Structure 1
Amino acid sequence: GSHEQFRAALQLVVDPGDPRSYLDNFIKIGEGSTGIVCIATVRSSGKLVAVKKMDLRKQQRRELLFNEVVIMRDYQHENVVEMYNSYLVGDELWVVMEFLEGGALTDIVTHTRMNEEQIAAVCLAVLQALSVLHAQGVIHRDIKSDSILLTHDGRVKLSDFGFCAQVSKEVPRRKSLVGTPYWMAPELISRLPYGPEVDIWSLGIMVIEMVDGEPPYFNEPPLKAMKMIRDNLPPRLKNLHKVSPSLKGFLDRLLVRDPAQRATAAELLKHPFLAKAGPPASIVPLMRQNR
Structure 2
Amino acid sequence: VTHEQFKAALRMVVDQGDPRLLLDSYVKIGEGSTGIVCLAREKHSGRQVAVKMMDLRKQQRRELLFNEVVIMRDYQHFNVVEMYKSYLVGEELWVLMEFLQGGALTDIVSQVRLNEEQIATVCEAVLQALAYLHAQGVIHRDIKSDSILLTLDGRVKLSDFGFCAQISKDVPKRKSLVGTPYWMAPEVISRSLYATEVDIWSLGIMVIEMVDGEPPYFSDSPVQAMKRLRDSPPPKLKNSHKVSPVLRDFLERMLVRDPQERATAQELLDHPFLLQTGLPECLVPLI
Is TM-score (shorter-chain normalized) higher than 0.5?
yes
- SS of residue paired to 1:86: strand
Q: Is the 8 A contact 2:71 2:161 kept in 1?
A: no
CA deviations over 1:68-94 (Å, ceiling 9, x no partner): 322431421110110111100011111
C-alpha separation in 1, matches of 2:281 and 2:42: 29
Q: What's the counterpart of residue 223 of structure 1?
A: 223
C-alpha separation in 2, matches of 1:68 and 1:28: 19
Does 2:197 correspond to 1:197?
yes
Does 2:259 correspond to 1:243?
no
Q: What's the counterpart of residue 207 of structure 1?
A: 207
Q: What's the counterpart of residue 77 of structure 1?
A: 77
Q: Which runs of 5+ in 1 are unaligned?
A: none
Q: What's the counterpart of residue 275 of structure 2?
A: 275
Which residue identity lines up with residue 175 of structure 2 in the other structure?
A: K
Matches within 5 A, 1:124-139: 124-139=124-139
Q: What's the counterpart of residue 162 of structure 2?
A: 162
Q: What's the counterpart of residue 116 of structure 1?
A: 116
CA deviations over 1:17-69 (Å, ceiling 9, x no partner): 11112000100111223111111010111110001111001112110001132
Does 2:14 correspond to 1:14?
yes
- SS of residue paired to 2:103: coil
Matches within 5 A, 1:84-95: 84-95=84-95
C-alpha separation in 2, matches of 1:47 and 1:279: 27
Q: Is the 8 A contact 1:75 1:82 kept in 2?
A: no
What is the total number of aligned residue pairs between the two structures? Answer: 287
CA deviations over 1:173-196 (Å, ceiling 9, x no partner): 111111110000000001101111
Q: Which runs of 5+ in 2 are unaligned?
A: none
CA deviations over 1:219-250 (Å, ceiling 9, x no partner): 11110000000000000000111000000000
- SS of residue paired to 1:34: coil
Which residue identity lines up with residue 223 of structure 1 in the other structure?
A: V
Q: Is the 8 A contact 1:181 1:226 kept in 2?
A: yes
Q: Is the 8 A contact 1:182 1:226 kept in 2?
A: yes
Does 2:110 correspond to 1:141?
no
Identity among equivalent positions (%) equals: 76
C-alpha separation in 1, matches of 2:171 and 2:7: 26
Q: Is the 8 A contact 1:154 1:282 kept in 2?
A: yes
- SS of residue paired to 2:95: strand
Which residue identity lines up with residue 190 of structure 2 in the other structure?
A: S
CA deviations over 1:194-229 (Å, ceiling 9, x no partner): 111010000000000000000000011110000000
Q: What's the counterpart of residue 30 of structure 1?
A: 30
- SS of residue paired to 1:120: helix
Which residue identity lines up with residue 258 of structure 2 in the other structure?
A: D
- SS of residue paired to 1:111: coil
C-alpha separation in 1, matches of 2:279 and 2:103: 18
Does 2:216 correspond to 1:255?
no
TM-score (normalised: structure 2):
0.98
TM-score (normalised: structure 1):
0.97
C-alpha separation in 1, matches of 2:111 and 2:99: 23
